[PDB]
Design a protein around this ligand. Structure first.
Ligand SMILES: Nc1ncnc2c1ncn2[C@@H]1O[C@H](COP(=O)(O)OP(=O)(O)OP(=O)(O)O)[C@@H](O)[C@H]1O
Ligand SMILES: Nc1ncnc2c1ncn2[C@@H]1O[C@H](COP(=O)(O)OP(=O)(O)OP(=O)(O)O)[C@@H](O)[C@H]1O
Ligand SMILES: Nc1ncnc2c1ncn2[C@@H]1O[C@H](COP(=O)(O)OP(=O)(O)OP(=O)(O)O)[C@@H](O)[C@H]1O
Ligand SMILES: Nc1ncnc2c1ncn2[C@@H]1O[C@H](COP(=O)(O)OP(=O)(O)OP(=O)(O)O)[C@@H](O)[C@H]1O
Ligand code: NA
Ligand code: NA
Lengths: 215, 215, 216, 215
């Protein structure tokens, strides 16, 4: 797998550093000279080039990369013209960072394989923690079911799993407990619930909220 | 709970729209006139003000908000001076959006309760999907254990749960199956695994990778 | 002693010229090309570099300097990020030029050994001379005692030291008299006070003001 | 005494706040709207005006002020044109903040009563403390004699005044000792010298340096 990242920003630079850490060949492309020099050591190859030019894009050997990431989310003209050239160049996978709803629709028309909203997806996840301080991190399996890593309160201290009727009343399944750095996968009845540690639970979205308010 | 969001960007504007959707009193503060007019309908109160000024900050009644979110991640001078005033004004919870590693350290010194890297955290999560196309969304319970929502391949088609020795060999637990829009929580042996649907699994980080390569 | 001065402004450039005059090894760092060329002859080593970058800061050998002066007082982002790198690099002495009260508090949190307000300290000293024209230069020993270099008026002309009851009534001690270029340290009774020359006095802050209004 | 300060900068704003604290009528003049609003409460009268215009300068009643301070030290054209109008308007006392050596000479030609270099005078005083850490604050009585407020070292601990032969050998007079917040004016023999407190001394410039190195 050969990866090309166009645009070394906060989002683009994180992909280059993470993929290079895992041991992948990453091409870092940016129009700014200072950005390329900073990420020269964090990428296999770093080039100062303009992605809106077809002649400069063909000089990079961009046709040899299966995955090309266009991490430009503040210049719609630069982002949409870059993916038009890549779609014309028959790139199998083009992942684009969008800015707003209208930028999402333009990329969908010109053939974006995946469109990413980094700030919008984090803003929704952060606001869920702001509304309810009991949650720490959640993953939406569907629109009605999710896995929520809850935080143990004072009333749940010194309580066994069998004492909590999550399975019968709330219809939720306890998944894991992070006992002060110790992690137990699929706890068996019964385990004592300690102080403010991570409590992983699984259930319906409305059913978990009932457990937070009541249990 | 009263929330104040300073800076209506891509990350700041997502928090205002999400918290207002859930039914919370949100104060939207931005120095740009066009940003405030766009988010006037998506916030309880929208004010055009400079957060670096103490006189303007006290005119907003900012001492009445438990949670203040400083979503400025491109101006270090504006972000650090804003949180210094809020820390001096005894705000119980200050959440700041950072830019880089050095911006993270300055906010930690001047008393930031939580520091958020929206683009950096998404860039790591996106790069995990780029490296392995089988994964769709994952949550890190710890540094060695995670819950990964996998994608079913062709070799797993028409296969029962008892056929897959994830519990014995790989030491991983199957959590949920998204059967073409139908979601089954904690499947019982045995369930037939269909085509390319979401397969939620739980196990050690190295153990899940063995299941992806072999199973 | 090796000194590094970051930012060649009106305040930063004065430190480079004064330390080089006394015979010290001074490193002059500035982001502006014209500033470095002007102070190239007034510093041991002058480099065009950005102090907010760790890679550029390590290329200067900045870990070999005991005293680093960050004389940036108009860019808070550049000033605070520079001192964060120096504090991370274990610089024994970091002296920072601040802009306002809020800039002073940020530098105190991130570990500034000394914070300097050049314009604010001069503005207070100048305003003391504006309010009272009799004073010329003063040093605050404490919040209630100071040494004030006064200016002799017409009523103090042809007056002896013993005639002035500064020691008994005002409780102030006359320290030195600059008699037209001639300086007398610790004058003995009695010395004739001439025309408008420098009269150094020492006493309580409220006691000196009584001498200016009544005696002077 | 009526004071007018033209230019509300770091140096100009300090004069307005100090003179208003002492109870003087201060006129604050600045071309920037935000500067005038900030110093409106710290001055008797604050006006947004351009000092280079004679019509605007006469609208302030500037002929009624004995002392006018032109605290502009980054715009030579604005600083020199302002003092030309004031000299033409017969202001008894004009104090100007200069920028460099060439700005000092222009103001001297066009009739500046006093020219001030705030950053240059502080830079010399700071560099004296940088070269010798024993000094704290000094005042130059002349080019060869000065009063230096020294810092007591470890070798001067538990030492009497009569033990130190400053009067005979070094020819210097000890003026005051700040004994941990207690200040003694003109100490009499003998007083014990404690740890790192302020030691005020008076003598020749070369004679004090000998005391620092030897005594
Ligand atoms: N035409 C272009 N070709 C290559 N790189 C470009 C081009 N235009 C912009 N870039 C670079 O892409 C990077 C990211 O762009 P930009 O800062 O506009 O987006 P962003 O949405 O603010 O980014 P992030 O949120 O990741 O910080 C920058 O380093 C910029 O220099
Ligand atoms: N001092 C300030 N007070 C209030 N709002 C400000 C201030 N400075 C900037 N803003 C606003 O905050 C918002 C976010 O800041 P900015 O665009 O600089 O950061 P960013 O990290 O690029 O944003 P994003 O959330 O889009 O990633 C912008 O709408 C900007 O106008
Ligand atoms: N990041 C930086 N690294 C090094 N030098 C810098 C940096 N940013 C600015 N400088 C330089 O530092 C010098 C002083 O900064 P600046 O002029 O902004 O402050 P100031 O308070 O107006 O200065 P002064 O009152 O001493 O004239 C300038 O010559 C400027 O070019
Ligand atoms: N023509 C003018 N009339 C009145 N005020 C002016 C004029 N031009 C500039 N000013 C103001 O004078 C003030 C000081 O000027 P400036 O900031 O350029 O000088 P400086 O030497 O850098 O300042 P500082 O006193 O902070 O060292 C500023 O607030 C500026 O807006
Ligand atoms: Na962004
Ligand atoms: Na200045």
């Amino acid at each position: 797998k050969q990866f090309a990242v166009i645009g070394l920003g906060r989002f683009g630079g994180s992909i280059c550093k993470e993929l290079h850490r895992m041991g992948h060949e990453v091409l870092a492309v940016d129009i700014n000279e200072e950005k390329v020099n900073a990420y020269a050591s964090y990428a296999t190859h770093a080039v100062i080039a303009n992605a809106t030019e077809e002649n400069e894009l063909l000089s990079l050997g961009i046709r040899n990369f299966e995955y090309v990431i266009v991490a430009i989310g503040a210049n719609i003209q630069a982002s949409t013209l870059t993916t038009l050239l890549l779609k014309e160049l028959d790139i199998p996978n083009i992942w684009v960072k969008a800015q707003n709803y209208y930028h999402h629709k333009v990329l969908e028309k010109i053939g974006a394989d995946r469109i990413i909203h980094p700030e919008k997806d984090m803003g929704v996840k952060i606001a869920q923690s702001l509304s309810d301080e009991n949650v720490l991190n959640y993953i939406d399996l569907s629109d009605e079911y999710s896995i929520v890593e809850l935080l143990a309160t004072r009333k749940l201290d010194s309580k066994s799993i069998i004492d909590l009727n999550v399975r019968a009343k709330y219809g939720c399944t306890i998944l894991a407990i992070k006992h002060h750095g110790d992690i137990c996968l699929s706890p068996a009845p019964e385990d004592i619930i300690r102080e403010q540690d991570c409590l992983v639970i699984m259930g319906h979205k409305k059913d978990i909220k009932r457990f937070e308010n009541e249990g």
